Design a binder for this molecule. Sequence first.
Ligand SMILES: Cc1cc2nc3c(=O)[nH]c(=O)nc-3n(C[C@H](O)[C@H](O)[C@H](O)COP(=O)(O)OP(=O)(O)OC[C@H]3O[C@@H](n4cnc5c(N)ncnc54)[C@H](O)[C@@H]3O)c2cc1N(C)C
Length: 394
Amino acid sequence: MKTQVAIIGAGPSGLLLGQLLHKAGIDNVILERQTPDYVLGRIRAGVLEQGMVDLLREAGVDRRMARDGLVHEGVEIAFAGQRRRIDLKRLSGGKTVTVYGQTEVTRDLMEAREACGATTVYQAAEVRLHDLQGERPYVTFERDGERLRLDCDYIAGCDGFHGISRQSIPAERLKVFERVYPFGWLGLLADTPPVSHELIYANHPRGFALCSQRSATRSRYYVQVPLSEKVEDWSDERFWTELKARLPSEVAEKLVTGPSLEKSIAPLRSFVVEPMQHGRLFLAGDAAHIVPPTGAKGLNLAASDVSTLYRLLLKAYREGRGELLERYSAICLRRIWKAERFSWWMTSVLHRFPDTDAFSQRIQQTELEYYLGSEAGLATIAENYVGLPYEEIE
Ligand SMILES: Cc1cc2nc3c(=O)[nH]c(=O)nc-3n(C[C@H](O)[C@H](O)[C@H](O)COP(=O)(O)OP(=O)(O)OC[C@H]3O[C@@H](n4cnc5c(N)ncnc54)[C@H](O)[C@@H]3O)c2cc1N(C)C
């Protein structure tokens, strides 16, 4: 096979980049290890930044989101028997976020790509990268038995945290920055109306809790749990009972519960590699960095990496300015770190950490009181939540 840009991974990152590149006349082939249905089984993200929303419209894949998505102008934080609303629209200068499931986004992109006739190879096993330092790199893989080769000009590693792309770069050329948190998020998707029209992040003595949604009739709740917990030990009943216990009584009382459509435990981690490229290989999304879900930045950083890489690839193909691709990592890393810092802060002030001394506890409580009780404080939260502006490039 032969293409211009080879893309590893049919997740949100690969699909969005592929779609974007396709519409601009740049040939691209996506290689996915799993099956279409397997990819669609992942719930994940719910909050999208305006930047991601715009990138979707630019990909021509926004019909459904426009119709089914919900724009939120604020979020609530509950702590120490208080409930503080963060007016995102007002504090950020008019910016908002949109609630639209990652599953739907992925689905919208997949159907759109199939309709356009772009190349996507699912169940592509043993993906291996080759000749990344040359001008003619290629990818090898196995499909239903035989080994195939895909020649290209550039490879976009969009294969997630455990993708092969980041492992295809000489370790000594990369610097890893990482932190694993002493707890995970037990999530529960239920076909019930959300308890609130806006998200509710709750710091409670018993632990973190979050009330989110996917639509007017679909909810997504999370509760903090230690690493030792196994999802099989948490029945829907146990979840609802614990969730209720971590929420203000006036909220737990009217909460509509129901059987889970999906339950699982996701560990929290911050991760960043520098640089994010190597020769003809560029890493995007989870392949290059991870953030705890607390700040709703994971998918949105994948979006900004993709926007940056796409625009640089345009410059390269349309304008023969391939040397600009050298600025990919630098550009992306600046937005990444600021998003990592916010995600870390959110995680830091909303979760209960084991072995917390009296001082740390008081500081965490005061962080909320100050940031939630100051116009300037609220502003640092809002502007970061809606997401910082994309860097123009060039
Ligand atoms: C609880 C949760 C909430 C989240 N909430 C939000 C949120 O509201 N807002 C937000 O911005 N982000 C959130 N996240 C994070 C977000 O979901 C992630 O950052 C996002 O999924 C990243 O997207 P991508 O970079 O595209 O990465 P993905 O992991 O989604 O997709 C990568 C694809 O690569 C494939 N693959 C892997 N190895 C391969 C190989 N060697 N060869 C070929 N294919 C391979 C995989 O099968 C897969 O299909 C969340 C993630 C969570 N979980 C479970 C991880």
